[PDB]
Amino acid sequence: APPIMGSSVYITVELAIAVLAILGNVLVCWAVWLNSNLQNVTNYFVVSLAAADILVGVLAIPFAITISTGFCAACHGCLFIACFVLVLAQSSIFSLLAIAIDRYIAIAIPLRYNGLVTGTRAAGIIAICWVLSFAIGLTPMLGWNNCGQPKEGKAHSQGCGEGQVACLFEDVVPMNYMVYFNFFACVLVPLLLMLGVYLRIFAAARRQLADLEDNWETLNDNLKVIEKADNAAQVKDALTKMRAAALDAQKMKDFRHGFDILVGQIDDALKLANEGKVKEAQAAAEQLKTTRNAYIQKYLERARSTLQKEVHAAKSAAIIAGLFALCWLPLHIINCFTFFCPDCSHAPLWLMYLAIVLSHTNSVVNPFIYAYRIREFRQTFRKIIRSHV
Ligand SMILES: CC(C)CCC[C@@H](C)[C@H]1CC[C@H]2[C@@H]3CC=C4C[C@@H](O)CC[C@]4(C)[C@H]3CC[C@]12C
Ligand SMILES: CC(C)CCC[C@@H](C)[C@H]1CC[C@H]2[C@@H]3CC=C4C[C@@H](O)CC[C@]4(C)[C@H]3CC[C@]12C
Ligand SMILES: CC(C)CCC[C@@H](C)[C@H]1CC[C@H]2[C@@H]3CC=C4C[C@@H](O)CC[C@]4(C)[C@H]3CC[C@]12C
Ligand SMILES: CCn1c(=O)c2[nH]c(/C=C/c3ccc(OC)c(OC)c3)nc2n(CC)c1=O
Numbered sequence: 001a002p003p004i005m006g007s008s009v010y011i012t013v014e015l016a017i018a019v020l021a022i023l024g025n026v027l028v029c030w031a032v033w034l035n036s037n038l039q040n041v042t043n044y045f046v047v048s049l050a051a052a053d054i055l056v057g058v059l060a061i062p063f064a065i066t067i068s069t070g071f072c073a074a075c076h077g078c079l080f081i082a083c084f085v086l087v088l089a090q091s092s093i094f095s096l097l098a099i100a101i102d103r104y105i106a107i108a109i110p111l112r113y114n115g116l117v118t119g120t121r122a123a124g125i126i127a128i129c130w131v132l133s134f135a136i137g138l139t140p141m142l143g144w145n146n147c148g149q150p151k152e153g154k155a156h157s158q159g160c161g162e163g164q165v166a167c168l169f170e171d172v173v174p175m176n177y178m179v180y181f182n183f184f185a186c187v188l189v190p191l192l193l194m195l196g197v198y199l200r201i202f203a204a205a206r207r208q209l210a211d212l213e214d215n216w217e218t219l220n221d222n223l224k225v226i227e228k229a230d231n232a233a234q235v236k237d238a239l240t241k242m243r244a245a246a247l248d249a250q251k252m253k254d255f256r257h258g259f260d261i262l263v264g265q266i267d268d269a270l271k272l273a274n275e276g277k278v279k280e281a282q283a284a285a286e287q288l289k290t291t292r293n294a295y296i297q298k299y300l301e302r303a304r305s306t307l308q309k310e311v312h313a314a315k316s317a318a319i320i321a322g323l324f325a326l327c328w329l330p331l332h333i334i335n336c337f338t339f340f341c342p343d344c345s346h347a348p349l350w351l352m353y354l355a356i357v358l359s360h361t362n363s364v365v366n367p368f369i370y371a372y373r374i375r376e377f378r379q380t381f382r383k384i385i386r387s388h389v
């Protein structure tokens, strides 16, 4: 069948994807720009990721359409339009890895996050990652390419000029680069590192939540021990365990006030215990319950609510990392079959184009994930569209 027919379908789908990638990710950038509640280090990497996806629509998809025609081109010019998308994919990987690491720092050492993770450092890291993305993605332009071995019969059949080749991705980009360097080293390894970071994030969240409820249980258990104690020494033992835990749990004004009352009331009871005044110590310790109800439970619940939101933000980020993998793995896997199985028939052209458009679909999906999973984005999206569009 005439190639322009299947080409028309491929090109039309690509153009549709390009429109959606531009519109959705422009909206992401506009939201971060407009809403100061969205201006944090995490979302600067989100913006860098949206910028890469905007350039997929503006440049990479037009380049992909061009290289599907096999037009006559100087080989290194053909190389650039083939490889530019690798720059954008690599930048996306760096942004996704940075987002994961940022969220791990926030959950594991929240006390030093704001001093460690600053806007100026994020902007410098983003700049560095874009430079490294060009070096990685344009590495074929430094000489790891097939321009030295042009397909002269294909060039002559298409009427190409001297020094020109039919511009086709797999004719100019070496497959060993795509499999060993681009896929294994530059894509697979960072994605696996991301998985490890997310596993540590969720394990850290689970441990901290367990410790909060466990510390609550230890506090309440020890009150019962004091109540049903029969000498002052048993009261002393339990209060000593309560006092060390209270100082451990203190590590905002009513928060500090609540713990000041709590530690003071424990010291009050411990002093009576050490005088052998059991009944007064048990009565003194009952006062702790008023402090527990008015203060400690509010701190516990707020700490629980903060940790659960951190789980929610890490899950949303992990979904976006997983969707990148889901959209890009088929094309990489196909390249692995082409490279490792020369006895296998090449994947058919229709499947090649399905795998290409699928990888381009990833530049559409993140704005939807933010809208459905992050209220602050969803509300900002609403105000921008309603008050303008
Ligand atoms: C800043 C942005 C908007 C500029 C975009 C520039 C792009 C479209 C330009 C820059 C380099 C250009 C390529 C440079 C060399 C060649 C080899 C020639 O035989 C065919 C055209 C081709 C393949 C060009 C296509 C267009 C190209 C990719
Ligand atoms: C969830 C995602 C990551 C899974 C992706 C699996 C896809 C990419 C796999 C599953 C089955 C695979 C195909 C199985 C058999 C062949 C025949 C061979 O002559 C060319 C490759 C080809 C056509 C494979 C291409 C890649 C393929 C389509
Ligand atoms: C964590 C996971 C997603 C890592 C990615 C899995 C990749 C590297 C695996 C999954 C399926 C694998 C392919 C399965 C079968 C064949 C056919 C064989 O004749 C050559 C190797 C080849 C082509 C494998 C190459 C590697 C491969 C593509
Ligand atoms: C992830 C990077 N990457 C690729 O690895 C890739 N590999 C191909 C090959 C396509 C093709 C193969 C055989 C053909 O005809 C026998 C053919 O005719 C038009 C096309 N395109 C790729 N693209 C998009 C530019 C990409 O972006």
Ligand SMILES: CCCCCCCC/C=C\CCCCCCCC(=O)OC[C@H](O)CO
Binding pocket: 058, 059, 062, 063, 066, 071, 072, 073
């Ligand atoms: C705001 C965005 C600014 C604009 C962003 C850039 C626009 C992208 C358009 C096209 C890439 C395709 C260009 C490659 C076309 C090559 C066709 C060609 O040169 O064929 C001649 C002949 O084959 C040689 O001998």
Ligand SMILES: CCCCCCCC/C=C\CCCCCCCC(=O)O
Binding pocket: 058, 059, 062, 063, 065, 066, 069, 071, 072
């Ligand atoms: C602001 C948007 C920037 C992109 C504008 C261009 C939109 C995409 C247009 C078509 C891609 C180029 C197709 C050229 C195919 C060349 C085939 C040939 O010369 O034989």
Ligand SMILES: CCCCCCCC/C=C\CCCCCCCC(=O)O
Binding pocket: 128, 135, 136
């Ligand atoms: C594939 C090419 C790989 C290139 C490896 C060498 C480039 C690495 C360069 C340095 C990365 C960090 C740069 C630090 C910038 C300055 C820091 C600062 O001034 O505070």
Ligand code: NA
Binding pocket: 049, 052, 053, 088, 089, 092, 362, 363
């Ligand atoms: Na991307």
